Symmetry: D2
Subunit: 318 residues, 4 copies
């Protein structure tokens, strides 16, 4: 039986007997994602180049902000693009807090690299006036999370309590079609993924781990290397093929480079629901209690056996 994102979400909403607010939010987000995908694929560019005589990340942010505000399902919105949390006007306020990166990887969009949208959804915990504090929850508290990848095609990956599900956008009809159900990552993979150009600044644990991938002590084949440089693409490949992705801490960056709330947490949630792992080195990404909405975190994620092996080496250097 064919299924779409909207029908899938409604169906799980009815099972759970909820009030429908999350379904309204997810539908609204989905509409924004389709609009971002259209702009990313350059629909209407002929008009920009004078066939008849706004920047992408800004527009992407405007689309998500506007669709979420008008969903009546949110109260606090945190974006990569905004210095402070956005507090939704009273008459539009609902019970969810949303942290997102509207167009991740967009630094490099000039070369037409895969880009994506990342989101994490929390329930507001207190009855106080909404504020930035409502977004400072650990990833464990996520109600739903995921990403849209604008790649060779556009795919939405949604993780919730029921698992991880992948939906392909059919641009002929503008629907997200469920194509991979309850997806689970390989126990162990054959690809490692990080920027080795910064090898001079690596922590010795990272240096050793990568050494073992290239020059395996035992009699096994070396791992392959892939690094797109766009987190959604690298993480999605990791989910699909297995393996490991690293944006670790060093001396220069003791808290890593990626953002905890709207990059590391949603991806860690997806990984964990898919039976993978995600660590900072010292603890599970999802257990970090944030104190700042734009705070950074080291991240190492992927197949469980690979992450465990990394942890073993990390401890040897602790």
């Amino acid at each position: 039986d064919v299924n779409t994102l909207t029908r899938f979400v409604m169906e799980e909403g009815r099972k759970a007997r909820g009030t429908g607010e999350l379904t309204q939010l997810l539908n609204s987000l989905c509409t924004a994602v389709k609009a971002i995908s259209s702009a990313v694929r350059k629909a209407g560019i002929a008009h920009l180049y004078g066939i008849a005589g706004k920047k992408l990340d800004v527009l992407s942010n405007d689309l998500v902000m506007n669709m979420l505000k008008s969903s009546f399902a949110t109260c606090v919105l945190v974006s990569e693009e905004d210095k402070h949390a956005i507090i939704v006007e009273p008459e539009k306020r609902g019970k969810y807090v949303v942290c997102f990166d509207p167009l991740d990887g967009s630094s490099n969009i000039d070369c037409l690299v895969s880009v994506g949208t990342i989101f994490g959804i929390y329930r507001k915990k207190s009855t106080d006036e909404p504020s930035e504090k409502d977004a400072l929850q650990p990833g464990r508290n996520l109600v739903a999370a995921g990403y849209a990848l604008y790649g060779s095609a556009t795919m939405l990956v949604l993780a919730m309590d029921c698992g991880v599900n992948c939906f392909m956008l059919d641009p002929a009809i503008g629907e997200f079609i469920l194509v991979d159900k309850d997806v689970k990552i390989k126990k162990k993979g054959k690809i490692y993924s990080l920027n080795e150009g910064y090898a001079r600044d690596f922590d010795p644990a990272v240096t050793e781990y990568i050494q073992r991938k290239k020059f395996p002590p035992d009699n096994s084949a070396p791992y392959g290397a892939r690094y797109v440089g766009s987190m959604v693409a690298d993480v999605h490949r990791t989910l699909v093929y297995g393996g490991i992705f690293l944006y670790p801490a060093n001396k220069k960056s003791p808290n890593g480079k990626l953002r905890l709330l709207y990059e590391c947490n949603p991806m860690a949630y997806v990984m964990e629901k898919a039976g993978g792992m995600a660590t900072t080195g010292k603890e599970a990404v999802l257990d970090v209690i944030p104190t700042d909405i734009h705070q950074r975190a080291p991240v190492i994620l992927g197949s469980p056996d690979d992450v465990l092996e990394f942890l073993k080496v990390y401890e040897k250097h602790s």
Copy 2:
């Protein structure tokens, strides 16, 4: 003034005063590229999943069919076919085309950027057409390029007049000229190769990569990027500058990438953009092929970066 691929090609055709065969070919190819892009972005997938109750193969069929019916080709070499395809007599024209209809497609399950690569030669011999007609050095290319199915779809076309980049506007199905007479940076800040085969590197590669990470002159280290799909890695190289390498290893002692329909078209694009492309021993475009699916090592990109690699290569004899 706005310009499109078809109008641009017609305009250059008139200036050269040709008979129009190459324009018919390029137009045909462009149509196939649009059809590939549509299928790659998964238009109509709902029908596959039962709303009413294979990609590399289709891509090949599209290019084959559009080129055959262009009346402009005689020999077609494809990554997908073991032998060259000889066009039936009534449809024969004067060009030979070597292509990879969907490069990077082994990894399409993860929605990595894929692309279409093509090189176009004039039939050189007066013999009945055969596989031999495709065994020309890259120097003989009349036109070459690629379509990248990335965050958006772009067609990059290199000819004698230079390199030009066209964005597909999917709202109207037209390729809009957005970057004219493109030139690569003299020197870049990114290197691109699969370092997972480090154990098999020849010592020249090992040293060159060491210098990118640990620069002797105390400049900043280069960034690393490797998509694992050649069209994407090469296009980034064109756009941001830097260097791309796929050298020989134990598994692939003649390099891994295919000379006719991967290495040559990209080398031609690079050279027309003021870049370089080498096997280590010689320019990629100077290799005389003996087999249509033969492999070649390749190092390409910004001139200063490729020349630096060659310095190190020479040091190791």
Copy 3:
């Protein structure tokens, strides 16, 4: 504030505190409409004509399949099917749906506007579902409307809260709310019917049309428009006002259009927009059907125009 069809329906569903079944139904239907629109605008036709080497049937398949799998329906009546379709037990929900999947399609060769028409009823009893569950008067409609595949694609949805119009944005595949709580003009300036059958007209129709062309009170004559596709004619009538007629004659004492899935949905839309719809003898919505494909005469549009028609009808007894 922007609004879409799905968000609009959900928000009215929550207000009404329903279980969500109607929302699942409407969302499913909306998906089928987008797929029909895509096929009607001929997406993928290049593949039909050999680039790599039925419409009414597909439209029906799309609606049938999307409604069955919505878990919200038990009985489906279609212009295309001689008997009602009874949904298999595990997929059965509480609603009955009558539809014409592609109205006007006999003339689709000339690219005339076509459309999809639908009416939705709540099931009558707790008995085993059967054809009988679809034989309700139009007054019982819970929701009704149409998609017009015209110069653009629009969905018109009528419910208790009124009539709302949504434009399909094909760039993103979303129905955008563009006209809220629409109301028809009290009186218009266009009449619409097939005057080629003038020899068979009831004398009341003859006289009414005469008065439109030769107005007794010295006002301007009405314009005439007749597309020959009911969704297009009715939508113009909603938007510009006026009157649409497919009346009874000697040859067709029950008219030509179908009551369940053409006349009733359009009458419901009209009435919710403050218009009227009559057979001549009674309101279309008051006819109690005895056969699912039964025909009905219909005269609909602006209230003043329909009332004037009725005056003349009464004069002829």
Copy 4:
């Protein structure tokens, strides 16, 4: 073997051994038509209604055609329904053709989503003088090419040239015009008449009688059907496809009719005649009228030959 508009045109251009200027013009026009179709089907309308949160459709349609034709290097004079005077192309962009067009016909009624279209006629510049409005005042007989795009249930381009009439469907998935009907010919006689009968009180008696005969046939054959979309491209296209007759005739109030000769009546008459149909003013072939003003009107009756001839019989009876 599959064929597209651009390939078809290039192929006929090579056969004729021309310099390619007409091909550049037709390709440019085709690009504008695809841009019009996209806008007509409302691509990007969510942005108008505040999804993140300009130009009217006939104005944009005109801008698209003007701009694409000017930059084709193939035109010198452009006449548009939208512009009071002819546009003379700047010297560096001048080519040998004159183009008369209606960029979005039927657009007055676009609020109800009726079919709309683009109509065009292409002439060779005849004189060697500086280009001017005069270059557009040629009889339809001098047309080199003409046709129309119908933005209907789907988008179709109909192209008439010396080689005949050919119909191309736009595949919006790839943005190509696919040849679907070759060398099309109209039926000898049809069963549909098409005009606005709301203005029956102002009809010429010839028209009144002709229509009477369609509804109440003297020889007791079946009556004709009536269809009137109110958008000329849609009514004319149905006439081409199903056969029959289309009328926008002259009356006492409008002795020269209502439709425009250069960019409505002529291109449609040329298409009809290349398809083996007819097009008359009543007094003469539409293509034989020598224009004296670029926006001048003309009465028009066109379609299947037998139907037009029958209309002319009745017209002659009323002197």
